[PDB]
Structure 1
Amino acid sequence: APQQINDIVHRTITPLIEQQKIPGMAVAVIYQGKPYYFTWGYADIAKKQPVTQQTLFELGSVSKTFTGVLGGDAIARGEIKLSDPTTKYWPELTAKQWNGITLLHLATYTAGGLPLQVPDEVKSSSDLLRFYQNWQPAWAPGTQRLYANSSIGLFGALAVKPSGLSFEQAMQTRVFQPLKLNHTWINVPPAEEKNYAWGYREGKAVHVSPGALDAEAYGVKSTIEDMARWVQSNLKPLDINEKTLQQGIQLAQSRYWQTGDMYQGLGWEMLDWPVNPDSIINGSDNKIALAARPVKAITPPTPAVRASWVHKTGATGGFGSYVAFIPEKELGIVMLANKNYPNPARVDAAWQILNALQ
């Protein structure tokens, strides 16, 4: 790749891998619409297996971007409406507090305080219904944003209801295949187990644990090659053949709510570019990222803005991921590590690199 790209990346990431003590890392820089890959360390320290272009990484919450786009596609297909009441897709969700909660609230974390996590005890479908039936809101819908798996996860599950397909099958056929993401999985199959990296937390090797709505909120595993494609597709959706997916990617980057200098899309979060580095860096700290924040409705939603810094952090017990891109500059980056390290460290590194290239 151009000396330029090589230079910043080495100077930025290599030291970061050292300071954070990251076992393995794959980085893809999309420059002028083209990807360049960088690789470091092991995918498995025990077997001294290295990180390659085919190593599978748990994306954590970056999965939410897939869920948001699957949702956008279902809307363009005419199968769902964001203005539709929740109970319209789950008739048993009868409790009165669910009355004015629509799919939009579920998708953007503005339903009124649904919890970040679905309790570990909730397992059966029964457990899930009872949990939602008993939930008491902390705020009226549409007033506060509270980042949560239990909100977007339910959105994913109801969004695929009309299609009659399971969440995984709707995702593979409607999103993975058309984009040719031939190595992205919710449930990695036998054949891919050997490329599936171990996550590392406290020197021990881990893989994400099953849980309710895990697939809908954080269950995707992928490679830097597919992820790079994922970023190219999101950078230039008009280049996408399938009509509903092209429109879905756009709906996913529309601005529905604003809080501070951030805008909430479906899965994706956006900021006007140029961006204030302190802002995105500090804002990514979990003290802030996980707190409730009042939101201002954007009426009507602003369609996908080219001059945006679009991004999403993800993490699981032993994995730390990050994606960011600026459509207007055909610039984007993907960072996958088999170690969960500080969000501010990822965002800073990404900002150094991208700011350097335009």
Structure 2
Amino acid sequence: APQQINDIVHRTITPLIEQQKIPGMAVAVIYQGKPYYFTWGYADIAKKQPVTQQTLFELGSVSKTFTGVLGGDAIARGEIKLSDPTTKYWPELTAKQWNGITLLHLATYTAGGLPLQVPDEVKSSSDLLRFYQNWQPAWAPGTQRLYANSSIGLFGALAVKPSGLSFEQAMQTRVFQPLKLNHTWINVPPAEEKNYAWGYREGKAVHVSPGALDAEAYGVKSTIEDMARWVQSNLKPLDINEKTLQQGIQLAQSRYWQTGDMYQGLGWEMLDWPVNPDSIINGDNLAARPVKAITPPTPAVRASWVHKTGATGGFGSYVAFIPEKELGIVMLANKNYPNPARVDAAWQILNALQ
């Protein structure tokens, strides 16, 4: 990589790894359509396996970006509309608090206080129904944003219903495969286990536990290479050949709501570029916030800092790109460490490259 890129990356990441005691980490910088990869430490401390460009990391919430794009693609195909009421896709949701809650609200965490986590006792399809039927909103829809897996996760499951495909088959077929993300998985197959890094929490090796709506909200695993390719696809969607996928990517970066200096897309979150670092950096763990509707939603704005933070019990990831500068970055680590530290590192790096 150009010495410049090499230096800013190493001088920023090296101290990060040491301060946060991160076991392993991979970073990709995408500059003008070219990726440069970097790796440090261990994917598996016990068996001394190093992190490589083929190491699979749990993306955690960064998976919501794939979900937002797949949903965006379903919209482009004419299969669903964000203005459709949720009950159109789950008519069994007859409890009246659901009247007025649209797929847009589910996708952008504005349904009225859907919880951060689906409860652990929710197993079966009927258990999920019961959870949503019994949930009591704190707010009318479209008034406040409360980050929630139970919200976009539900969006993801309904989004793929007209297609006939399961969420995983839709994702592989309409998103992963077309984008040639061949080492990106919702379920890691036995053949790829040798590359599946262990996450580390309190010194113990851990992998994400199965859970209701996990695939839709936080269950994707991927390599720094596929993730860099994911970033390039989002940086330049107009270069994607699949018509609906190209529109889907654009739809996921549309600004639907505003809170403070942040705009909510489908999965992706955005701020106007240039951004104040303390605006995105300090902008840390998930609170209840009033939202102003953007009527109609603003189409993807090239001068934006588009990003998504993500974590599982043992992994910490972050993705950010500036379309206008054809610049992006991916940081994958097998330790959930403070969000502000990820954003600060990403900012030092990207700001240095323009």
TM-score (norm 1): 0.99
Matched, 1:319 2:307: no
**In 2, Cα distance between equivalents of 1:166 and 1:222:** 20
Which secondary structure does the structure 2 equivalent of 1:193 belong to? Answer: helix
Unaligned runs of 5+ in 2: none
Residue 126 (structure 1) shift: 1.2
**In 1, Cα distance between equivalents of 2:2 and 2:160:** 43
Residue 216 (structure 1) shift: 0.4
**In 2, Cα distance between equivalents of 1:102 and 1:143:** 13
Which secondary structure does the structure 2 equivalent of 1:126 belong to? Answer: helix
Superposed CA offset, 1:212-258 (max 9, x none): 00000000000000000000000000110000000000000000000
**In 1, Cα distance between equivalents of 2:40 and 2:147:** 32
Residue 292 (structure 1) shift: 0.6
Residue 168 (structure 1) shift: 0.1
**In 1, Cα distance between equivalents of 2:353 and 2:55:** 27
Matched, 1:228 2:231: no
Superposed CA offset, 1:142-188 (max 9, x none): 00000000000000000000000000000000000000000000001
**In 2, Cα distance between equivalents of 1:38 and 1:12:** 12
Superposed CA offset, 1:51-106 (max 9, x none): 00100000000000000000000000000000000000001000000000000000
**In 2, Cα distance between equivalents of 1:85 and 1:15:** 49
**In 1, Cα distance between equivalents of 2:151 and 2:229:** 27
Aligned to 1:118: 118
Which secondary structure does the structure 1 equivalent of 2:174 belong to? Answer: helix
Residue 33 (structure 1) shift: 1.4
Aligned to 2:100: 100
Superposed CA offset, 1:289-339 (max 9, x none): x10100000000000000000000000000000000000000000000000
Matches within 5 A, 1:180-195: 180-195=180-195
Residue 124 (structure 1) shift: 1.0
Unaligned runs of 5+ in 1: none
Which secondary structure does the structure 2 equivalent of 1:311 belong to? Answer: strand
TM-score (norm 2): 1.00
Residue 196 (structure 1) shift: 0.3
**In 1, Cα distance between equivalents of 2:125 and 2:350:** 44
Matched, 1:335 2:331: yes
Matches within 5 A, 1:278-317: 278-283=278-283, 285-286=284-285, 290-317=286-313
Structure 1 stretches (4+) deviating beyond 6 angstroms? Answer: none
Residues paired across the two proteins, number: 354
**In 2, Cα distance between equivalents of 1:340 and 1:211:** 19
**In 2, Cα distance between equivalents of 1:122 and 1:259:** 31
Identity fraction in percent:
100
Residue 32 (structure 1) shift: 1.4
**In 2, Cα distance between equivalents of 1:230 and 1:36:** 14
Aligned to 2:19: 19
Which secondary structure does the structure 1 equivalent of 2:345 belong to? Answer: helix
**In 2, Cα distance between equivalents of 1:133 and 1:10:** 50
